[PDB]
Amino acid sequence: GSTRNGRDSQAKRLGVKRYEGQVVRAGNILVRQRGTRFKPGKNVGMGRDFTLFALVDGVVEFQDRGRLGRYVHVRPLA
Amino acid sequence: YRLKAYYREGEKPSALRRAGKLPGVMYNRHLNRKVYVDLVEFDKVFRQASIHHVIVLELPDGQSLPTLVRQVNLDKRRRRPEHVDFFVLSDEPVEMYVPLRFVGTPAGVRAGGVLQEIHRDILVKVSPRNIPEFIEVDVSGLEIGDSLHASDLKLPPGVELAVSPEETIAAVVPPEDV
Amino acid sequence: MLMPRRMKYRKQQRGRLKGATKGGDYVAFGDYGLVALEPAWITAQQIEAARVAMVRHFRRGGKIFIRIFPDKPYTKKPLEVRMGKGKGNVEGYVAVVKPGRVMFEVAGVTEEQAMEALRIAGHKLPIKTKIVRRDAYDEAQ
Amino acid sequence: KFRVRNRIKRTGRLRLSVFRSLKHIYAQIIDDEKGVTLVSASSLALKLKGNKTEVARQVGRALAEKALALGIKQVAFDRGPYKYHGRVKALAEGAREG
RNA sequence: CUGACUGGGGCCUGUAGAGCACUGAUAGGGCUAGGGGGCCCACCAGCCUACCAAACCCUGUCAAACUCCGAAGGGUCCCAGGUGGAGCCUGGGAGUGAGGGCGCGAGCGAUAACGUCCGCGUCCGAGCGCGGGAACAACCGAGACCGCCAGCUAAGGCCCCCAAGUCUGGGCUAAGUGGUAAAGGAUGUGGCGCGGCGAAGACAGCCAGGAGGUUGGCUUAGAAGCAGCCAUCCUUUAAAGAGUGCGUAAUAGCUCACUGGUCGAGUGGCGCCGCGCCGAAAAUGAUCGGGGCUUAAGCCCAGCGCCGAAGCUGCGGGUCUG
RNA sequence: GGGCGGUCGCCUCCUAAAAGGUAACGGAGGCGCCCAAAGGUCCCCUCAGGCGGGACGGAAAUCCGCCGGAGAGCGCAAGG
RNA sequence: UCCCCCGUGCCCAUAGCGGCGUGGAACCACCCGUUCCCAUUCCGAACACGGAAGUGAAACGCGCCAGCGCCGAUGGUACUGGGCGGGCGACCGCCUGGGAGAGUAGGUCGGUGCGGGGG
Ligand SMILES: [Mg+2]
Ligand SMILES: [Mg+2]
Ligand SMILES: [Mg+2]
Ligand SMILES: [Mg+2]
Ligand SMILES: [Mg+2]
Ligand SMILES: [Mg+2]
Ligand SMILES: [Mg+2]
Ligand SMILES: [Mg+2]
Ligand SMILES: [Mg+2]
Ligand SMILES: [Mg+2]
Ligand SMILES: [Mg+2]
Ligand SMILES: [Mg+2]
Ligand SMILES: [Mg+2]
Ligand SMILES: [Mg+2]
Ligand SMILES: [Mg+2]
Ligand SMILES: [Mg+2]
Ligand SMILES: [Mg+2]
Ligand SMILES: [Mg+2]
Ligand SMILES: [Mg+2]
Ligand SMILES: [Mg+2]
Ligand SMILES: [Mg+2]
Ligand SMILES: [Mg+2]
Ligand SMILES: [Mg+2]
Ligand SMILES: [Mg+2]
Ligand SMILES: [Mg+2]
Ligand SMILES: [Mg+2]
Ligand SMILES: [Mg+2]
Ligand SMILES: [Mg+2]
Ligand SMILES: [Mg+2]
Ligand SMILES: [Mg+2]
């Protein structure tokens, strides 16, 4: 007659942290993702927990186009 | 048959459908022209003039359009039509759903079922000249166990047959005993 | 009564009752239909009480059609119990219905007998349920 | 539907493509995400020698001197359908160095 | 000049909605791995299953923990507007960490609570200062610096307490509905559309031979139209069934569905729609604030005015900031 | 309301209102570990099922061919 | 300044699936062997090597077929920021913008780069 189950985990708080059209530095996390919802393009590196970040600085761009997954492209400025 | 038409130029029409003037649109290959028809004329002819009959539509340009219905959107807690999609037929074997029916003793009338699966006789495409008004299906002896239709004896006179399937057709169900 | 034999989870929520119909206005099975007009719930006791009131009314012919299925567990706490301490027990599965949805559809019953039978089963439900016949208002092209 | 796809990684952005047919071979050098073939050296387009595995030395010197003639050094090497065995086209000029 | 907010461009989501292709449940119909099994046969040499039923395909569905789909919105970044008790950085100084109401999106509850707990916003708290709602913090308007025997308005009203129309029109309600709530019911009225009939005479009326095979057939006593069965008739006629309700144990009988006239110009079934009636019985004295109100002093669509705050302007005076 | 009962930390899904967060004695479940390979690099292959068969074989052991684009598997509950 | 074929791409099922053609002078594939460099929990099937006497059957390209699959228009609501009201409640109505998912018409069995071979 008691409460069977009333606990819940603390949120790890994932999500897209840098959208496109944003000037970034070398090292900014583009997206905190649980699984690899985004695939690395140019100048994009993954880590341990599928987190991809920028290798250089510039204006970032998404969706080169599909059929393999969503793309992240850190494009440098010239 | 013999229904009037008008024009629409991107109006309000939720405010126009208060006096029994529901909107519409007709086409055969192009010219998606927005019209509105009258509700007691369209409803009164639409009492018996079903999908099989070619409802013709007088237009202020002087043309008589051989149309039919594509869908009647039910008002869904009011039981009314919002918008009816007309379909002009052209020189093309267009698609038709003909409400055929059943005549005869169903299953030996005392030991009879229901024969409720009408389902609008799934599809028959036709030229505009060989289009029918009524095709008859008999139910000569079809008692409870055997003798089902199975669309094998579904050869209509002429044009055309059912295209892909032969599976949806009426059958005999047992009654509700106490 | 009747109940779903398998579920993913036992208890679930209530929600709201808005929306028009989400399907279920065209009859497509029988020649008549008992269509609802007010949003409420349909218990399995309301299903049984309306289903018995057909087969006991008309006999030897006419198949009855039901197009309602209870998948929502009505959750009620026991009597003289304070608030909290989890949800209550499950007593009977209810069925959410929307206005303008056709619930009961008679088959093989005539006009003056189907109006009467749907009139008898109309009083077994807490909803204003009017009666519609077979019209040309199908979804065919 | 056989494919190995060692051409999918592309960390180095400049590769030398190799195709080995059962008659002879031919090779290209592609620039990635642009779609422009810079230089190539093809057997039976220059018809160097009959034996198919003796091609790799002369097309290695030929594609090497045409690569240095076009002024590209930092290149790479694909292994899409084929093992690094048999023909090698080994070179000592250009940054492939294998 | 970056800020709240807004405009022009991208990016993101998986909620509302919708859907079954995925995860499960499912109302039927067809096909039938097979199984109590087999009509029962040298067992495979079957046959229909009115026996059950796997899996598959259609007509149909449901989902916070399902998404092939998928907005309105929100967030973020670039440019522009935005000089505002706007923002940004540092330091000093408190208070708060019992909240509550309302509308929406929700959970628990019982789709109960002026009930509990979140989010989006407002208000009270801290504006119990003001006007309306009779009185009342969160329902509406409005953000009170002070003063004037000045106007215009917001919400709400214009029969009197109570300041302003017994205003001008078109209908509606006979219940004090207004001024207390549901399922259901009823020639209550007013409006729209369909059908039949009709002055080759229509409805309710008053008179009529209101019938012959035929008590059709063991119907278990009894089946004459009338407890309940078959497969449902025909012919005599200027109109009549295997009968509309009684009445009989069954009879008999009374009324008929169907129709002939001397009459008389309209007559029934409906499907919506506005306001109504019953359902509606609690405990000190009753009432919509009260008196009263019926071509209204209620209800629906309008129009011209007026009353109406501490709101705004007319004027004077003080303070604070630039 | 307190006591009795249940819970005290971490993870997964929903509630949770399409950025992030978000409560209840709200619903459904797991954990206090394990792998010298169940790690790194390099090189080969594509799964689970269904159909047609087999010599045993439950309708699942092992083998062949076709269909099968991810319904399998990824140490462990759930999600990606 | 063009057609055919081979590599390598970008569009992300309008590119595939299934059926019907067609091609080897020219590439490519098939084939004949394994003798060595190589390999197989086993085998030259797949990697590797000599070839190349025979072939386009299979696979591979091009062309056709809309049903199989996919994409999918104008209206019309569902829904909803925002504002205004109704119902005792469950929940609805109007205006202003925005605007789906199914379904219907229809479309398709490809479009477009770079470098080579032959005419
Ligand atoms: Mg493949
Ligand atoms: Mg590989
Ligand atoms: Mg290979
Ligand atoms: Mg600015
Ligand atoms: Mg900003
Ligand atoms: Mg904006
Ligand atoms: Mg959802
Ligand atoms: Mg939903
Ligand atoms: Mg947007
Ligand atoms: Mg401030
Ligand atoms: Mg505290
Ligand atoms: Mg607190
Ligand atoms: Mg709170
Ligand atoms: Mg409270
Ligand atoms: Mg409440
Ligand atoms: Mg305040
Ligand atoms: Mg007070
Ligand atoms: Mg007041
Ligand atoms: Mg106040
Ligand atoms: Mg002030
Ligand atoms: Mg005034
Ligand atoms: Mg006065
Ligand atoms: Mg009342
Ligand atoms: Mg008047
Ligand atoms: Mg002021
Ligand atoms: Mg002044
Ligand atoms: Mg979220
Ligand atoms: Mg949100
Ligand atoms: Mg590993
Ligand atoms: Mg209720």
PDB file of C-alpha atoms in Angstrom, chain B:
ATOM      1  CA  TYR B   1     -26.992  16.252 -62.681  1.00  0.00           C
ATOM      2  CA  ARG B   2     -27.705  19.824 -63.870  1.00  0.00           C
ATOM      3  CA  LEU B   3     -26.216  21.836 -61.009  1.00  0.00           C
ATOM      4  CA  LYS B   4     -25.278  25.510 -61.204  1.00  0.00           C
ATOM      5  CA  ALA B   5     -21.779  26.855 -60.555  1.00  0.00           C
ATOM      6  CA  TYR B   6     -20.112  30.169 -59.706  1.00  0.00           C
ATOM      7  CA  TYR B   7     -16.603  31.558 -59.130  1.00  0.00           C
ATOM      8  CA  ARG B   8     -14.311  32.073 -56.152  1.00  0.00           C
ATOM      9  CA  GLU B   9     -11.357  34.470 -55.984  1.00  0.00           C
ATOM     10  CA  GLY B  10      -9.760  33.660 -52.633  1.00  0.00           C
ATOM     11  CA  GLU B  11     -12.575  34.753 -50.314  1.00  0.00           C
ATOM     12  CA  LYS B  12     -13.643  34.251 -46.648  1.00  0.00           C
ATOM     13  CA  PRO B  13     -15.701  31.216 -47.401  1.00  0.00           C
ATOM     14  CA  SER B  14     -16.254  30.065 -43.787  1.00  0.00           C
ATOM     15  CA  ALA B  15     -18.420  33.203 -43.682  1.00  0.00           C
ATOM     16  CA  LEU B  16     -19.881  32.371 -47.117  1.00  0.00           C
ATOM     17  CA  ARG B  17     -21.053  28.878 -46.109  1.00  0.00           C
ATOM     18  CA  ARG B  18     -23.688  30.185 -43.663  1.00  0.00           C
ATOM     19  CA  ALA B  19     -26.539  30.451 -46.208  1.00  0.00           C
ATOM     20  CA  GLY B  20     -25.990  27.015 -47.736  1.00  0.00           C
ATOM     21  CA  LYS B  21     -23.162  27.800 -50.188  1.00  0.00           C
ATOM     22  CA  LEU B  22     -20.309  25.346 -49.632  1.00  0.00           C
ATOM     23  CA  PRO B  23     -17.100  25.834 -51.669  1.00  0.00           C
ATOM     24  CA  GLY B  24     -15.587  23.474 -54.227  1.00  0.00           C
ATOM     25  CA  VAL B  25     -12.952  22.901 -56.897  1.00  0.00           C
ATOM     26  CA  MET B  26     -12.947  20.974 -60.185  1.00  0.00           C
ATOM     27  CA  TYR B  27     -10.251  19.656 -62.532  1.00  0.00           C
ATOM     28  CA  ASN B  28      -9.556  16.992 -65.142  1.00  0.00           C
ATOM     29  CA  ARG B  29      -5.864  17.609 -65.909  1.00  0.00           C
ATOM     30  CA  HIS B  30      -5.354  21.317 -65.043  1.00  0.00           C
ATOM     31  CA  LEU B  31      -7.389  24.507 -64.366  1.00  0.00           C
ATOM     32  CA  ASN B  32      -7.844  24.106 -60.609  1.00  0.00           C
ATOM     33  CA  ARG B  33     -10.743  26.562 -60.516  1.00  0.00           C
ATOM     34  CA  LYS B  34     -12.342  27.388 -57.167  1.00  0.00           C
ATOM     35  CA  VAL B  35     -16.155  27.284 -57.203  1.00  0.00           C
ATOM     36  CA  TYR B  36     -19.034  27.158 -54.728  1.00  0.00           C
ATOM     37  CA  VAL B  37     -22.323  25.285 -55.098  1.00  0.00           C
ATOM     38  CA  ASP B  38     -25.662  25.398 -53.296  1.00  0.00           C
ATOM     39  CA  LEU B  39     -26.335  23.076 -50.376  1.00  0.00           C
ATOM     40  CA  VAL B  40     -29.990  22.149 -50.906  1.00  0.00           C
ATOM     41  CA  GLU B  41     -29.419  21.611 -54.640  1.00  0.00           C
ATOM     42  CA  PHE B  42     -26.219  19.626 -54.071  1.00  0.00           C
ATOM     43  CA  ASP B  43     -27.771  17.806 -51.113  1.00  0.00           C
ATOM     44  CA  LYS B  44     -31.083  17.155 -52.896  1.00  0.00           C
ATOM     45  CA  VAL B  45     -29.439  15.786 -56.044  1.00  0.00           C
ATOM     46  CA  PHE B  46     -26.854  14.090 -53.788  1.00  0.00           C
ATOM     47  CA  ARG B  47     -29.627  12.113 -52.027  1.00  0.00           C
ATOM     48  CA  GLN B  48     -29.791   9.525 -54.818  1.00  0.00           C
ATOM     49  CA  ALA B  49     -27.184  10.785 -57.328  1.00  0.00           C
ATOM     50  CA  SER B  50     -24.302   8.750 -55.917  1.00  0.00           C
ATOM     51  CA  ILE B  51     -20.655   8.391 -56.979  1.00  0.00           C
ATOM     52  CA  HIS B  52     -21.530   6.288 -60.062  1.00  0.00           C
ATOM     53  CA  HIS B  53     -23.619   9.030 -61.692  1.00  0.00           C
ATOM     54  CA  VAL B  54     -21.891  11.811 -63.617  1.00  0.00           C
ATOM     55  CA  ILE B  55     -23.085  15.061 -62.034  1.00  0.00           C
ATOM     56  CA  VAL B  56     -22.938  17.781 -64.695  1.00  0.00           C
ATOM     57  CA  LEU B  57     -22.211  21.367 -63.744  1.00  0.00           C
ATOM     58  CA  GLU B  58     -23.423  24.439 -65.615  1.00  0.00           C
ATOM     59  CA  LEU B  59     -20.930  27.301 -65.541  1.00  0.00           C
ATOM     60  CA  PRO B  60     -21.391  31.002 -66.453  1.00  0.00           C
ATOM     61  CA  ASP B  61     -19.062  30.516 -69.461  1.00  0.00           C
ATOM     62  CA  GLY B  62     -21.748  28.285 -71.000  1.00  0.00           C
ATOM     63  CA  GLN B  63     -19.983  24.938 -70.518  1.00  0.00           C
ATOM     64  CA  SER B  64     -21.531  21.792 -69.023  1.00  0.00           C
ATOM     65  CA  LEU B  65     -18.873  20.074 -66.924  1.00  0.00           C
ATOM     66  CA  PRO B  66     -19.116  16.267 -66.536  1.00  0.00           C
ATOM     67  CA  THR B  67     -17.979  16.122 -62.910  1.00  0.00           C
ATOM     68  CA  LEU B  68     -18.190  13.697 -60.013  1.00  0.00           C
ATOM     69  CA  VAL B  69     -17.222  13.660 -56.335  1.00  0.00           C
ATOM     70  CA  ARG B  70     -13.769  12.962 -54.900  1.00  0.00           C
ATOM     71  CA  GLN B  71     -14.460  13.506 -51.189  1.00  0.00           C
ATOM     72  CA  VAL B  72     -17.162  14.931 -48.930  1.00  0.00           C
ATOM     73  CA  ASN B  73     -15.567  16.260 -45.754  1.00  0.00           C
ATOM     74  CA  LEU B  74     -17.925  15.477 -42.884  1.00  0.00           C
ATOM     75  CA  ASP B  75     -18.295  18.242 -40.331  1.00  0.00           C
ATOM     76  CA  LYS B  76     -17.641  15.684 -37.578  1.00  0.00           C
ATOM     77  CA  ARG B  77     -20.024  16.661 -34.664  1.00  0.00           C
ATOM     78  CA  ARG B  78     -22.243  18.557 -37.059  1.00  0.00           C
ATOM     79  CA  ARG B  79     -22.727  16.033 -39.966  1.00  0.00           C
ATOM     80  CA  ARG B  80     -22.326  18.604 -42.764  1.00  0.00           C
ATOM     81  CA  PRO B  81     -20.075  19.113 -45.793  1.00  0.00           C
ATOM     82  CA  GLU B  82     -17.353  21.726 -45.622  1.00  0.00           C
ATOM     83  CA  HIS B  83     -15.784  21.342 -49.064  1.00  0.00           C
ATOM     84  CA  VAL B  84     -16.512  18.932 -51.922  1.00  0.00           C
ATOM     85  CA  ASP B  85     -13.783  18.152 -54.460  1.00  0.00           C
ATOM     86  CA  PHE B  86     -15.316  17.863 -57.925  1.00  0.00           C
ATOM     87  CA  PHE B  87     -13.599  15.903 -60.703  1.00  0.00           C
ATOM     88  CA  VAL B  88     -14.143  16.704 -64.374  1.00  0.00           C
ATOM     89  CA  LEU B  89     -13.857  13.713 -66.693  1.00  0.00           C
ATOM     90  CA  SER B  90     -11.967  14.131 -69.972  1.00  0.00           C
ATOM     91  CA  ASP B  91     -11.005  11.853 -72.863  1.00  0.00           C
ATOM     92  CA  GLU B  92      -9.408   9.322 -70.491  1.00  0.00           C
ATOM     93  CA  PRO B  93     -10.445   6.047 -68.788  1.00  0.00           C
ATOM     94  CA  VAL B  94     -11.019   7.675 -65.391  1.00  0.00           C
ATOM     95  CA  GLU B  95     -11.608   5.858 -62.099  1.00  0.00           C
ATOM     96  CA  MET B  96     -15.125   5.119 -60.852  1.00  0.00           C
ATOM     97  CA  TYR B  97     -16.663   3.608 -57.731  1.00  0.00           C
ATOM     98  CA  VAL B  98     -20.094   2.225 -58.647  1.00  0.00           C
ATOM     99  CA  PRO B  99     -22.495   1.217 -55.838  1.00  0.00           C
ATOM    100  CA  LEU B 100     -23.547  -2.180 -57.174  1.00  0.00           C
ATOM    101  CA  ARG B 101     -26.071  -4.099 -55.095  1.00  0.00           C
ATOM    102  CA  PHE B 102     -27.364  -7.593 -54.391  1.00  0.00           C
ATOM    103  CA  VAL B 103     -30.706  -9.100 -55.392  1.00  0.00           C
ATOM    104  CA  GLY B 104     -32.264 -12.480 -54.636  1.00  0.00           C
ATOM    105  CA  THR B 105     -32.713 -14.665 -51.588  1.00  0.00           C
ATOM    106  CA  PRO B 106     -29.561 -14.056 -49.475  1.00  0.00           C
ATOM    107  CA  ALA B 107     -28.994 -17.443 -47.809  1.00  0.00           C
ATOM    108  CA  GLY B 108     -32.334 -19.194 -47.923  1.00  0.00           C
ATOM    109  CA  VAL B 109     -34.251 -16.311 -46.339  1.00  0.00           C
ATOM    110  CA  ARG B 110     -35.137 -17.998 -43.032  1.00  0.00           C
ATOM    111  CA  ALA B 111     -31.520 -19.163 -42.620  1.00  0.00           C
ATOM    112  CA  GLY B 112     -30.239 -15.834 -43.915  1.00  0.00           C
ATOM    113  CA  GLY B 113     -27.273 -13.728 -42.865  1.00  0.00           C
ATOM    114  CA  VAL B 114     -26.903  -9.957 -43.222  1.00  0.00           C
ATOM    115  CA  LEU B 115     -24.741  -9.347 -46.346  1.00  0.00           C
ATOM    116  CA  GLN B 116     -23.530  -5.977 -45.108  1.00  0.00           C
ATOM    117  CA  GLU B 117     -20.125  -5.596 -46.821  1.00  0.00           C
ATOM    118  CA  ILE B 118     -21.076  -3.152 -49.558  1.00  0.00           C
ATOM    119  CA  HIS B 119     -17.747  -1.177 -49.449  1.00  0.00           C
ATOM    120  CA  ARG B 120     -18.623   0.643 -52.738  1.00  0.00           C
ATOM    121  CA  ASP B 121     -17.391  -2.174 -55.014  1.00  0.00           C
ATOM    122  CA  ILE B 122     -13.762  -1.379 -54.817  1.00  0.00           C
ATOM    123  CA  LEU B 123     -12.745   0.203 -58.183  1.00  0.00           C
ATOM    124  CA  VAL B 124     -13.650   0.154 -61.876  1.00  0.00           C
ATOM    125  CA  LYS B 125     -11.962   2.431 -64.409  1.00  0.00           C
ATOM    126  CA  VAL B 126     -13.910   3.288 -67.541  1.00  0.00           C
ATOM    127  CA  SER B 127     -13.987   5.304 -70.738  1.00  0.00           C
ATOM    128  CA  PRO B 128     -16.531   8.180 -70.697  1.00  0.00           C
ATOM    129  CA  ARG B 129     -18.742   6.432 -73.282  1.00  0.00           C
ATOM    130  CA  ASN B 130     -19.026   2.977 -71.675  1.00  0.00           C
ATOM    131  CA  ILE B 131     -19.708   4.314 -68.161  1.00  0.00           C
ATOM    132  CA  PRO B 132     -22.554   2.417 -66.445  1.00  0.00           C
ATOM    133  CA  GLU B 133     -25.405   3.474 -64.197  1.00  0.00           C
ATOM    134  CA  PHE B 134     -26.181   0.118 -62.563  1.00  0.00           C
ATOM    135  CA  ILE B 135     -24.543  -3.311 -62.490  1.00  0.00           C
ATOM    136  CA  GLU B 136     -26.333  -6.169 -60.731  1.00  0.00           C
ATOM    137  CA  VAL B 137     -24.973  -8.817 -58.356  1.00  0.00           C
ATOM    138  CA  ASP B 138     -27.234 -11.716 -57.375  1.00  0.00           C
ATOM    139  CA  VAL B 139     -27.061 -13.722 -54.161  1.00  0.00           C
ATOM    140  CA  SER B 140     -28.431 -17.047 -55.515  1.00  0.00           C
ATOM    141  CA  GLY B 141     -27.936 -19.684 -52.977  1.00  0.00           C
ATOM    142  CA  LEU B 142     -25.211 -18.622 -50.574  1.00  0.00           C
ATOM    143  CA  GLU B 143     -25.904 -20.388 -47.256  1.00  0.00           C
ATOM    144  CA  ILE B 144     -23.884 -19.969 -44.097  1.00  0.00           C
ATOM    145  CA  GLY B 145     -20.892 -22.287 -44.472  1.00  0.00           C
ATOM    146  CA  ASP B 146     -19.774 -22.400 -48.117  1.00  0.00           C
ATOM    147  CA  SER B 147     -20.660 -20.395 -51.273  1.00  0.00           C
ATOM    148  CA  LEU B 148     -18.793 -17.130 -50.867  1.00  0.00           C
ATOM    149  CA  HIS B 149     -18.052 -14.601 -53.625  1.00  0.00           C
ATOM    150  CA  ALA B 150     -14.244 -14.061 -53.302  1.00  0.00           C
ATOM    151  CA  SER B 151     -14.337 -11.744 -56.405  1.00  0.00           C
ATOM    152  CA  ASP B 152     -13.603 -14.668 -58.752  1.00  0.00           C
ATOM    153  CA  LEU B 153     -17.009 -14.289 -60.435  1.00  0.00           C
ATOM    154  CA  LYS B 154     -16.414 -10.550 -60.719  1.00  0.00           C
ATOM    155  CA  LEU B 155     -16.349 -10.183 -64.501  1.00  0.00           C
ATOM    156  CA  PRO B 156     -18.405  -7.040 -65.265  1.00  0.00           C
ATOM    157  CA  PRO B 157     -19.752  -6.398 -68.776  1.00  0.00           C
ATOM    158  CA  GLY B 158     -17.034  -4.553 -70.668  1.00  0.00           C
ATOM    159  CA  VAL B 159     -14.808  -1.826 -69.272  1.00  0.00           C
ATOM    160  CA  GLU B 160     -13.096  -2.426 -66.956  1.00  0.00           C
ATOM    161  CA  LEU B 161     -12.368  -5.098 -64.360  1.00  0.00           C
ATOM    162  CA  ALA B 162     -10.901  -4.530 -60.915  1.00  0.00           C
ATOM    163  CA  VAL B 163      -7.274  -3.704 -61.537  1.00  0.00           C
ATOM    164  CA  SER B 164      -5.009  -5.141 -58.834  1.00  0.00           C
ATOM    165  CA  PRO B 165      -7.013  -6.932 -56.055  1.00  0.00           C
ATOM    166  CA  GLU B 166      -9.685  -9.646 -55.823  1.00  0.00           C
ATOM    167  CA  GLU B 167      -9.969  -9.838 -52.046  1.00  0.00           C
ATOM    168  CA  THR B 168     -12.562  -7.361 -50.682  1.00  0.00           C
ATOM    169  CA  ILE B 169     -16.126  -8.573 -51.309  1.00  0.00           C
ATOM    170  CA  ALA B 170     -19.271  -9.379 -49.304  1.00  0.00           C
ATOM    171  CA  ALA B 171     -19.763 -12.589 -47.328  1.00  0.00           C
ATOM    172  CA  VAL B 172     -22.309 -14.300 -45.069  1.00  0.00           C
ATOM    173  CA  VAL B 173     -22.292 -13.832 -41.288  1.00  0.00           C
ATOM    174  CA  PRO B 174     -24.190 -15.863 -38.646  1.00  0.00           C
ATOM    175  CA  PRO B 175     -27.149 -14.181 -36.901  1.00  0.00           C
ATOM    176  CA  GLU B 176     -27.371 -13.063 -33.256  1.00  0.00           C
ATOM    177  CA  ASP B 177     -29.063 -15.823 -31.276  1.00  0.00           C
ATOM    178  CA  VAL B 178     -30.268 -15.395 -27.704  1.00  0.00           C
TER     179      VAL B 178
END
